[PDB]
Design a binder for this molecule. Structure first.
Ligand SMILES: NC(=O)c1ccc[n+]([C@@H]2O[C@H](COP(=O)([O-])OP(=O)(O)OC[C@H]3O[C@@H](n4cnc5c(N)ncnc54)[C@H](O)[C@@H]3O)[C@@H](O)[C@H]2O)c1
Ligand SMILES: NC(=O)c1ccc[n+]([C@@H]2O[C@H](COP(=O)([O-])OP(=O)(O)OC[C@H]3O[C@@H](n4cnc5c(N)ncnc54)[C@H](O)[C@@H]3O)[C@@H](O)[C@H]2O)c1
Ligand SMILES: NC(=O)c1ccc[n+]([C@@H]2O[C@H](COP(=O)([O-])OP(=O)(O)OC[C@H]3O[C@@H](n4cnc5c(N)ncnc54)[C@H](O)[C@@H]3O)[C@@H](O)[C@H]2O)c1
Ligand SMILES: NC(=O)c1ccc[n+]([C@@H]2O[C@H](COP(=O)([O-])OP(=O)(O)OC[C@H]3O[C@@H](n4cnc5c(N)ncnc54)[C@H](O)[C@@H]3O)[C@@H](O)[C@H]2O)c1
Ligand SMILES: [Mg+2]
Ligand SMILES: [Mg+2]
Ligand SMILES: [Mg+2]
Ligand SMILES: [Mg+2]
Lengths: 345, 333, 333, 334
């Protein structure tokens, strides 16, 4: 390569738009990254609300450090972070606080055209969307395809929680055995786009309208359909859907697939274990969803759930991987942000 | 047959619609919310806590049919711009949660508008606040805006009134252990009202919060003005609540006398039970308040007594039943 | 009028009793469990997920009255020691979960005992396994012990049969997203069956677990023997479940053709819907299985196709409705 | 370094084990339950509400290794038959819930048995009942069987003691809004103890139930004997609870005086906060009781005052922290 990455001693200043579940957890992880520092947060509320929500967290625990509210922001372990309440990305003066890269984590500007509103005079230089960002934006799952970045990009995508879970599992199947086709079901924690109790859903979804913590709720997901953005050779081969269920975080992805090469359960499991790294984990323990809350793997393969069914010479393969849709995704997002910040030019 | 409109087809609005189906002399001809007819029709048909709709619902142009009868749906954000009179609407159920004052609710009353408004919530001290079968006799029919009180007030009032009439209340403190509601966040996030506790995941926490029901009880029971205060603990059930009152009394009492007084005060609004029930057993009940004799305490220490009385309520259907009883009576006069 | 005995007045036993109140030719005259009549009467009257009993229940000496009719209650731990014949009982619903085999269920059949038994669960390969309206024609009336199968089998069977009859099934894999059940721990603790996942808090986790419904489908639909396998993900709802099947077929299909085949297969046991429902909408239904056309997929890649079909079931009431249909039919022949 | 045994490797037993890993003078060499080592090792490693175990756990013949150190596991149903002395065990944490009395807990003490027992629950009126940093001074070290009280008692005691010492309590009523526990049914079914409310689905209901914490407060704070009574509302959180006390006092007070008195009473056992927290924020805390100044009320009507004071507790880890403090102290002076 010729990427001439900055050292982690060269601290890149970052902005967060949307201090929500992903925004706040990203902020937490950035405290333990040497070369990245958050100097500006933009949301729709006062500093006290945001400071309180950083300090206390229902699913991810108390903040590791001190948080203290101040005029126009709050201090985190002594260091001041500016807070603003600007509804339009175009009006945020990111350059005032030295911000080069924005984490776009509101859920309202997840496209090239909308995210580009952050890039203007007195604005930011680059934007990382914390969600799928359309087919014209480079979409990175860290340790699967982050080598597609050269640092000249203005808008990139960190993909979805489900994509970060599925990608290394699907890639391992492809590289070892060849994937012909497959169908995915993710059994997913409820999220902030569902209603706490039955009521009109602003996006017109009749199922997200329903009480999220009291129902099994079917819903759509693009993670299988858009896997070609991450793994080109799987383009058009996967499709899927979700069943959202009453846990506040923690999810699992099942993939049923046909393969080119013949396999046994043992060979499938061995292939996953050999593909394991900081992003893709491996376990043979019979765990449940609470055991993956707060993990740093993007995807945790569960060898206890593997199936290989051969009937009349035709085989279906089932592979299953866990993910904390909050912290698993956030860990991948911050790995990508850190890498992008180093090569940004 | 008085024609009614519903502003805010939410939990209270939809359940009020359901109950109005079995009340002759009241009929809903117009619904106003912020969404399309297909969304509202689906939410009427299917209900997580209150069950499937008893009847047929079918989406049409600009509304939906309920058992063959068309109801118009509009999506007007401002009360002033709703043409209620077009559909014959005299009385409006103001059930959005955003216009719970005399000035704001009066916006429904204009040319091509409505005549009267019932606020499905506390509406201030200058609006008559009615708990049915406790103080609905204060209505004369000339009022423009009235309040149906809160869910907690409809629970508390008959229980507090029975203690006052029989034994006299000196003072008391109330705790309501309450179902989570739509004003809490599904997961931890910024609360638009500035509440740091309603900001938290409502179905995953015991969440302390404020309530005005005990402090404002004087609007319903004048003789208890200034005598009660309280608070709430919101907990992970999607509907169904309970109110505890700890009080000092003028007269000496026993557990049996307290329970007997409640039984004697029982009616369509105020129920009585000695069964050891739990919250799921009161989901969908028609009582505004269900006294539970199994939870009564009378503690006497060194001549001084504290009395504990407890009543169940479905914050949804118990309140809605009361609301529709008041609507029916108000429309008649 | 055939007289029925219930062993194990649990979730299935109590709901079977409830359904039998609306079946004219059948009557429960004896209940056996491990507790006193007051506990059982209370648990009949009040039900967290299925609502208040539609009737009166009053505790008496050695049992309870349901709408004035006495039902005898015993607490006999061993099936061989229950004197079923005393109360005219000919057929026993074996619903404890502890006697789900031919040899164990046969203990009910003795002198002063019952004549026949229906196990409310899988009961082994030497017991006829019946899903009503899929294979109840295998019964001739001479059987002593039969099986009503599982909840998942009653969901999966009509959906799989419809695929087979119309298109021909080659193979398939099943996932059921299932309500937690009484065999899971309320909080993390030692599981008596040795299951490390059922040991975990059932209402606070997604819990993978095994199921035999797909593997044993050959007992119900012979032509699908050895063709299906599956597993479960148990999740935090107290009742209500859904079965997804991904399959390969002999004929080429479209989404529209698959949905049309299910609609044509629909009967009292197998329902059809195009409404975008969620799990609470199927609690208390009478269908054994409710096909959801909104979740169908037909994926064709390089000439090869996978088909996904999904059906809802209330693991409690859907199963119980099938069980009582089979019980009635088995009693009449 | 005193060697300890655990009878009942349940919620309290397992969390007690976890805390003992960070106590220098105490060490667990024997666990007794009703299951195989693989089940117990798995339940130690993975915990729904309290998180993954900080350390390595590996199953072996007849037990498991924790960071390379072997701990013996047995499955003896009767306390009389457990040979505690074989593994050097002097003090036993009795955490099954089935032997919470002097007579039943004494069964552990025999030849080849243990010397002393700490019951992780109320143990009756004839056993010394200790809330650490409230009345652990009543121990002299000669006792055979002691009690660590209940979760609610450990919450209530320092709050009630602070009111008594500063202002004087006449009487009071307590409501604890409590997490569901292992003695409730997961779904509606026959309750073996005959309780018609604990028979109901614990994670789907508000469930009224009895508690003895207020009535038996005299065992911990003698001067409050016969002055308090209460009850519980069990609700759908898997751990985390809160205790409300409404009381009449001898002295007149303000909200500020009441809060200041609690802050002055604060220590490792009794915490103080002014932050508007919720139950998830107290899961895993080491305070036995955490006073919440945001919920205090002082209502005066016609010269007569009622005072409301509220404290949080993680019925699991708050109680366990107090239990291990008392165990450590009791072992030191034995
Ligand atoms: N939660 C997950 O599991 C998860 C996983 C991966 C990706 N994501 C994606 O991350 C994004 C955020 O998800 P979340 O769960 O954190 O949502 P959230 O609702 O918790 O956070 C959204 C935040 O954005 C703020 N906001 C909304 N509109 C704004 C505006 N115009 N300007 C500034 N701030 C605004 C809100 O006040 C809130 O704090 C979405 O794109 C989502 O799809 C979420
Ligand atoms: N839910 C309860 O337990 C309960 C009990 C008693 C009283 N209340 C009161 O009833 C009211 C409604 O509560 P809810 O739980 O039904 O709330 P909800 O959120 O379920 O219903 C609110 C409805 O109003 C609509 N709406 C919002 N703004 C609007 C506008 N400008 N114009 C038109 N429609 C608009 C929303 O789309 C929604 O359908 C509140 O005042 C509440 O305090 C609720
Ligand atoms: N709940 C479901 O979703 C469901 C669905 C289909 C099939 N089943 C099957 O039905 C059976 C019962 O399941 P459930 O959910 O009703 O369980 P449950 O625990 O609710 O009911 C079991 C009942 O049997 C009683 N019992 C136990 N041992 C007994 C004995 N020796 N003698 C008499 N009574 C005894 C218990 O006291 C209890 O009342 C099981 O075989 C289960 O697999 C359950
Ligand atoms: N859980 C709480 O919130 C809490 C709080 C304070 C005190 N306590 C007390 O702690 C005790 C245990 O409560 P828990 O919640 O940990 O219960 P639990 O059900 O989680 O633990 C009980 C354990 O004891 C084992 N056991 C049962 N009978 C046994 C026997 N005869 N011999 C050996 N082991 C046996 C069981 O297998 C199980 O592992 C009770 O006395 C309870 O009142 C509990
Ligand atoms: Mg940093
Ligand atoms: Mg009518
Ligand atoms: Mg009948
Ligand atoms: Mg130690």
């Amino acid at each position: 390569s010729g990427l001439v990455p900055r050292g982690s001693h060269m601290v890149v200043k970052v902005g967060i738009n949307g201090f929500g579940r992903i925004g706040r957890l990203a902020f937490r992880r950035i405290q333990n990254v040497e070369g990245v520092e958050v100097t500006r947060i933009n949301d729709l509320t006062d500093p006290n609300m945001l400071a309180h929500l950083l300090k206390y967290d229902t699913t991810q625990g108390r903040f590791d450090g001190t948080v203290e509210v101040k005029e126009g922001g709050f201090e985190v372990n002594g260091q001041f972070v500016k807070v603003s309440a600007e509804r339009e990305p175009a009006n945020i003066d990111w350059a005032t606080d030295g911000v080069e890269i924005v984490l776009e984590a509101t859920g309202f500007f997840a496209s090239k055209e909308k995210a580009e509103q952050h890039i203007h005079e007195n604005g930011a230089k680059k934007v990382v969307i914390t969600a799928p960002g359309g087919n014209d934006v480079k979409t990175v799952v860290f340790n699967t395809n982050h080598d597609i970045l050269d640092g000249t990009e203005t808008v990139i995508s960190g993909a979805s929680c489900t994509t970060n879970c599925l990608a290394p599992m699907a890639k391992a199947l492809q590289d070892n055995f060849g994937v012909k086709q497959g169908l995915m079901t993710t059994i997913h924690a409820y999220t902030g786009d569902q209603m706490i109790l039955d009521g009109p859903h602003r996006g017109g979804d009749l199922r997200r309208a329903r009480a999220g913590a009291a129902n099994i709720v079917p819903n759509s997901t693009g993670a299988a359909k858009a896997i070609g953005l991450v793994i080109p050779e799987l383009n058009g081969k996967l499709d899927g859907a979700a069943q959202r269920v009453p846990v506040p975080t923690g999810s699992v992805t099942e993939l049923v697939a046909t393969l080119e090469k013949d396999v046994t359960v043992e060979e499938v499991n061995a292939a996953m274990k050999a593909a394991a790294n900081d992003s893709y984990g491996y376990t043979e323990d019979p765990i449940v969803s609470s055991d993956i809350v707060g993990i740093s793997y993007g995807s945790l393969f569960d060898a206890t759930q593997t199936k290989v069914q051969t009937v009349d010479g035709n085989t279906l393969v089932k592979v299953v991987s866990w993910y904390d849709n909050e912290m698993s995704y956030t860990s991948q997002l911050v790995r990508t942000l850190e890498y992008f910040a180093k090569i940004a030019k």
